[PDB]
Design a protein around this nucleic acid. Structure first.
Lengths: 129, 121
RNA sequence: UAGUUGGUGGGGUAAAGGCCUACCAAGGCGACGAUCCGUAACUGGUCUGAGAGGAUGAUCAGUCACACUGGAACUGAGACACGGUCCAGACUCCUACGGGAGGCAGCAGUGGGGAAUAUUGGACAAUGGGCGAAAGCCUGAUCCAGCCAUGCCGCGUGUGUGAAGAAGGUCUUCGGAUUGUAAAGCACUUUAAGUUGGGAGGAAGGGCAGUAAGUUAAUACCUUGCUGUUUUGACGUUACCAACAGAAUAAGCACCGGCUAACUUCGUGCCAGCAGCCGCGGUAAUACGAAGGGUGCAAGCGUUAAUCGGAAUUACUGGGCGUAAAGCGCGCGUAGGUGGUUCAGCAAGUUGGAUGUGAAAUCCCCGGGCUCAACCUGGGAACUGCAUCCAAAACUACUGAGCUAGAGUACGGUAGAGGGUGGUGGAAUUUCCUGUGUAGCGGUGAAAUGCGUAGAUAUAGGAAGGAACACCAGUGGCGAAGGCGACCACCUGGACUGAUACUGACACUGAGGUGCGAAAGCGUGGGGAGCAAACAGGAUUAGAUACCCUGGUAGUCCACGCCGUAAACGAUGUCGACUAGCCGUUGGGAUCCUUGAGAUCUUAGUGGCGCAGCUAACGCGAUAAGUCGACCGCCUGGGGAGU
RNA sequence: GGGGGACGGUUACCACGGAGUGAUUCAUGACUGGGGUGAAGUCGUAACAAGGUAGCCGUAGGGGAACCUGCGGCUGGAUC
């Protein structure tokens, strides 16, 4: 009985970049398949595939610019039981604008740089460096 | 502790109390004296400290301390006590202002005269 | 909690209502904390803080509540009325003894309390109120003075030159060093304070006269423009300006061992004394008392009292629980918290916007006035809020439909000290009976108490009775935990493993509440082999209640009921998901050449090492203390005290 | 004269005061139970090394006092 799916996608990513894996495969959803699209366009993974029929999977390939990986830390903000909501003024900035922060707004899941341009607040998900 | 416990029982900040329990929220206090002992300090010192016991206008019967180098304090004479915790003696929690009402300060003193109440030559 | 909670009928009040009454009905509130106890006027704001917050409600402003104590109404637009009325009480005073009088929580003032808080001022000129509008009259609210280093801000207490580096002081290796250009000496300067002269602004009006407009039937009156003339200031010796005197009129306070800026001599010798903590003082003290010197601040400096910081030391932002304090003894489960996956709807959360509001002051920003500043003041932002509308639809909620990965059922199949109720064994111990046999047995560092010819120990035969269950037996099993080992029947719970169909999220955790709880102990009844607290004797011993020795009762055993704690231990809450390896072992399927002392792989347990990683360290390391989620319990210095 | 009004009378409501029985809170009390401290003193030597009988936790019984013994549990147990 797992209570939160999206803090389990991020846990497998953080663990596989210490076993120095390349491909990671977890079950999918219509939210996890949209978060990995955002991490690809910002650029942290190689690609992703939704390839099955009745238990649809998510196969993510990871990057290594060095022996050190490209993602160095990631934490879940709106843990189920806290539900962090932010307007555009109080919306956070990670590392002076060098990390990414993923905010579920009225116009779809987009990063903090995009919704602040459109002026739409919403709900934070994570703070990836 | 999780958030859903602190909603049910919030964090209650613990409180202190005054190290000077008598003279309730006031800087000085007068009292008449009863006895002038001369007690001995604790172990690592060796001396003979001079201690008077005062009955205030609150009705409390607390011991006090007398500084300086020589006191004219015969019994049934009013004083004016103030706080101050002497580490050496046990049970002593109050000093005594010199030169205020009856204690009349010290004599032949030329360093720090506003303490102990001495004039200017 | 019984006008208590509703209903009905009637009253009552400016006005809805148990506001009140008569019957009807038996409701209402409460663990989201009612009721009761203890304290306290709330708010805009002030004080700290980077912020989140934390304390606190002096002066200024809004609201409430009282006017010696307890009642009560009248009058009236509006009081259940601070200088009104009636009553009762307490307390002062008057009296011809019959009776009366009074209420500073208005401004001053006295007494008292206390560490502690001001003059029995000046006026109506200003702004305002009340009455009359006809001027005027009242005003201890206002506007002004007096007192108090009670606070913030500003200015003085002279400036330059001057080394014989003077006396004088202190220290010294006796050479000097230092106080020090500091003085003295010389040349200038005069703000403030003192003295003299001058001198605004706060003044708008009112009176009187004249004139022009509109009122009218009558520019008679009156109202209004305007003109002319006359009169007004408590402050007040006003701010401000000019002149005169002359360097004259004017500096303390704490500290100097470390935190902590700044040091050496002289007294004193565990004395006196010092202290915010560390701690100094027993004869050389950079800590006590002095003297020079020096550092901090200044018209102030120090101590005490009291809040917030530092304190991530109640941790929302921002901590912890293997051994430092801290995981309930273990389950099941109500309220509550959280929710796998596809569509569709909806718009309660959420985001964006608009309007109404959030008193003025205060804080902040840009300006403007007082010679500057404090102070005064114009414009903006802000006041994080709450409410009403409009739109968006990702996520959560709600609603409608599905899907099978969680979870559960049906079917084969194994393994087990998992329970309960009876039954039956064999070895050994003891008591008893009987034969043979005859001097010690037993015990201990060594002995003694004890047991023995009244025939013991030994030895053989027999009987009775009680409890425990060698070997197998193992880091081995099972159980939620405590616990569970003879064999068989009898009922009876759950786990594993395989195949296959079905239900289609039916799940997780759990304050309160419900259960099962080693051993010792307690109650009534059984039963009495050994063992054995209490106890008795011997020995050891300065002494020995103790260890050691010989005895020995409750108890241990069974049935029924109780108690509820343990180092109740993995000193580690339950549940779910990912993360290098290697060697063992229980049970179960696989695949596999087949003879295997087979092989490899996969789940469910149970052990030994180990890389990343974490950790104060020790050490854990797919059975985490690693990386992350959901809910619960608990910790806040040591004693006092789990009292 | 009626009407109406006043004053008296009387009932309702109500303050003071008086009665009984309770709670709760301070103030104090002959004698008693512990605790903390101190520096002198007497009795012992329980614990820390296998502390000289391995310690501790629960429970019962006993004893000048630390403590001793019984039953069960524990390693936070050292020698091999």
């Amino acid at each position: 009985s797992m209570q939160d799916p999206l803090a389990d996608m991020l846990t497998r990513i953080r663990n596989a970049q210490m076993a120095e894996k390349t491909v990671v495969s977890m079950p999918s959803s219509k939210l996890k398949a949209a978060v990995a699209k955002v991490l690809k366009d910002e650029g942290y993974i190689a690609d992703f595939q939704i390839s099955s029929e009745v238990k649809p999977q998510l196969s993510i390939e990871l990057k290594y610019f060095e022996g050190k990986p490209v993602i160095e830390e990631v934490k879940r903000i709106s843990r189920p039981g806290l539900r962090q909501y932010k307007s555009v003024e109080q919306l956070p900035k990670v590392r002076g604008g060098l990390g990414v922060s993923i905010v579920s707004t009225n116009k779809g899941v987009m990063t903090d740089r995009a919704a602040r341009a459109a002026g739409v607040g919403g709900e934070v998900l994570c703070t990836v460096f | 502790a999780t958030i859903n416990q602190l909603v049910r029982k919030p964090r209650k900040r613990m409180v202190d109390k005054s190290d000077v329990p008598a003279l309730q929220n006031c800087p000085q206090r007068r009292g008449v004296c009863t006895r002038v002992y001369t007690t001995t300090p604790k172990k690592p010192n060796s001396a003979l400290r001079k201690v008077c016991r005062v009955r205030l206008t609150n009705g409390f019967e607390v011991s006090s301390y007398i500084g300086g180098e020589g006191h004219n304090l015969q019994e049934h004479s009013v004083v004016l006590i103030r706080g101050g915790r002497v580490k050496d003696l046990p049970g002593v929690r109050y000093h005594t202002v010199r030169g205020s009402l009856d204690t009349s300060g010290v004599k032949d003193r030329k360093q720090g005269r506003s303490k102990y109440g001495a004039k200017r030559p």
